[PDB]
């Protein structure tokens, strides 16, 4: 069921996660007034390498889905597994976790920085 770009925006986070490859395929897409598009198609790829660099410095690199060894804190809106993945949407979710997104982003890139140095020991 290829609903299309952002086809599952009202679908549950569990329901939307089947479309993750449909939102990211169309994320990069391949005299004056002719510069309207140049300064804007440049802002279209810095937006890409800003996101991909977070995906790189986390334990992800490879795309779409990826786990981390960061325990989830209960104060970040304590829902349950069946209260998030079967009764909430990604828009509705990032509204409660918009306060904590910056807090969390640090742990992923630091918990990963501990894993790689430990990886060099055991080689």
């Amino acid at each position: 069921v290829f609903l299309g770009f952002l086809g599952a925006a009202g679908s549950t986070m569990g329901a939307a996660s089947m479309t993750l490859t449909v939102q990211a395929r169309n994320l990069l897409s391949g005299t004056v007034w002719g510069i309207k598009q140049l300064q804007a198609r440049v802002l279209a790829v810095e937006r890409y390498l800003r996101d991909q660099q977070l995906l790189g410095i986390w334990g992800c690199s490879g795309k779409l889905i990826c786990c981390t060894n960061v325990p989830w804190n209960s104060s970040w809106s304590n829902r349950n597994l069946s209260e998030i993945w079967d009764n909430m949407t990604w828009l509705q979710w990032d509204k409660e976790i918009s306060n904590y997104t910056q807090i969390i982003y640090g742990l992923l890139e630091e918990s990963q920085n501990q894993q790689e140095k430990n990886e060099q020991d055991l080689l």
């Binding site: 986070m13 939307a16 993750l20 804007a40 890409y48 998030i84 990604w90 997104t101």
Partner: protein
């Protein structure tokens, strides 16, 4: 297991409101229109034959037409479309000479001027005794005449190759962004929209610079639409959109002549020669049968907001500047300025011919309030005729009963009547969420 771990998801349906640099799109037959780049389309991107459209079910997103930035980026783009088209065109700096002028051969009311002047030829030596022919709004006396702009703005002459014909313009957004199209039939452009769908580039929006009468715009759905920023405030314009279009015809039935007096070397001014045929003026026709039913269709919508058993009256413009009072518009190159005292002379209570409208004409213009200097559009040969669609009105309210009068002036309103159903967001594909996985 029972303790939960964070996980990264890339490519989620997550967007926030933001503004980005928007660009253009415009078919491929529009590029075959050529004629030395008409209006805007040159290195602009062609529209692919794929028009992708995706209905986002269950989604409801709050629009806002009166705070939409596609307007400010469309207005200021059309502003700079003007100037880029006049930079390499012929400049009339030596055309502020003393004009000795007279009436037009008639047998009455003066409307036109037969003007004679001195003129720089190609060589920087001998002068030239040649004559033009300017409308009364082009000139002004000094105690013998002079052009109406010479005491204000230095002037430039529109190139005769380019065409001022509104072609469809599709706005777009780059990667990481998207544009939402509300797709319900009753939406006053503000509030939540139930049936939201997403698109990459908007529908063809012909930049029609008009006042009072909205021309060649999108037709509304079902009931005619009444859109306002604050209906209780009498200081905000009341945008109207029709369901049925109203037919308007406009002729310039004067078989005029184009004189090409060379103010060289190189440059050359285009004037008005002698007039072949009868001394008539330009007139726009509106069918009496169509304007009566469409006027009553709006006032039943006005009763929905100003009391059920209220009396709604209409009068002409309160006054002030010329542009506000008249129906300014382009067609065939010339700029008409038409009197709407006959379209707004009605008084509605709680419950077969044409309407001809007098139109002036002017060559020298200062467009969008203040931008682009002057522009002396070149005269147009033959009888110009054109049909337009009245697809909306721009009304204002006065400060029991309520009256409404036509308005305009600010050209940012004309775009909103086509951009009410669009808004801009940025895609944030990085969302975190917990699940019982660990590496």
């Amino acid at each position: 297991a029972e303790n939960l771990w964070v996980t990264v998801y890339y490519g989620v349906p997550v967007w926030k409101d933001a503004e980005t640099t928007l660009f253009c799109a415009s078919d491929a037959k529009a590029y075959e229109t050529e004629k030395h780049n008409v209006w805007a389309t040159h290195a602009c991107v062609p529209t692919d034959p794929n028009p992708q459209e995706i209905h986002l079910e269950n989604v409801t997103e709050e629009f806002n037409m009166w705070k939409n930035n596609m307007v400010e980026q469309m207005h200021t783009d059309i502003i700079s479309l003007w100037d880029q088209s006049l930079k390499p065109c012929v400049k009339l700096t030596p055309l502020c000479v003393t004009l000795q002028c007279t009436n037009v051969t008639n047998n009455m009311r003066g409307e036109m001027k037969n003007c004679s002047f001195n003129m720089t030829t190609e060589l920087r030596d001998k002068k030239q005794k040649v004559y033009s022919l300017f409308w009364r709004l082009d000139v002004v006396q000094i105690n013998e005449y002079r052009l109406i702009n010479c005491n204000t703005s230095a002037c430039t002459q529109a190139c005769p190759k380019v065409s001022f014909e509104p072609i469809p313009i599709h706005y777009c957004a780059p990667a990481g962004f998207a544009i939402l199209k509300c797709k319900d039939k009753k939406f006053n452009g503000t509030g939540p929209c139930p049936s939201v769908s997403t698109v990459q580039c908007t529908h063809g929006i012909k930049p029609v610079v008009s006042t009072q009468l909205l021309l060649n715009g999108s037709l509304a759905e079902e009931e005619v639409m009444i859109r306002s920023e604050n209906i209780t405030n009498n200081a905000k314009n009341i945008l109207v959109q029709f369901n049925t279009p109203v037919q308007i015809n406009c002729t310039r039935p004067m078989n005029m002549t184009r004189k090409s007096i060379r103010i060289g070397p190189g440059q050359a001014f285009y004037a008005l020669g002698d007039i072949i045929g009868d001394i008539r003026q330009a007139h726009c026709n509106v069918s009496k049968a169509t304007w009566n039913e469409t006027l009553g269709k709006v006032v039943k919508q006005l009763r929905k907001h100003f009391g059920n058993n209220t009396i709604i009256r209409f009068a002409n413009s309160s006054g002030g500047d010329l542009e506000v009072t008249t129906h300014s518009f382009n067609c065939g190159g010339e700029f008409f300025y038409c009197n709407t005292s006959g379209l707004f002379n009605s008084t509605w209570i709680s419950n077969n011919d044409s309407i001809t409208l007098p139109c002036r004409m002017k060559q020298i213009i200062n467009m969008w309030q203040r931008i682009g200097q002057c522009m002396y559009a070149p005269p147009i040969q033959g009888v110009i005729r054109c049909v337009s669609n009245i697809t909306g009105l721009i009304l204002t309210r006065d400060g029991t009963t309520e009256t409404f009068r036509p308005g305009g002036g600010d050209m940012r309103d004309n775009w909103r009547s086509e951009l009410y159903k669009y808004k801009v967001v940025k895609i944030e594909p990085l969302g975190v969420a917990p699940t019982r996985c660990k590496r």
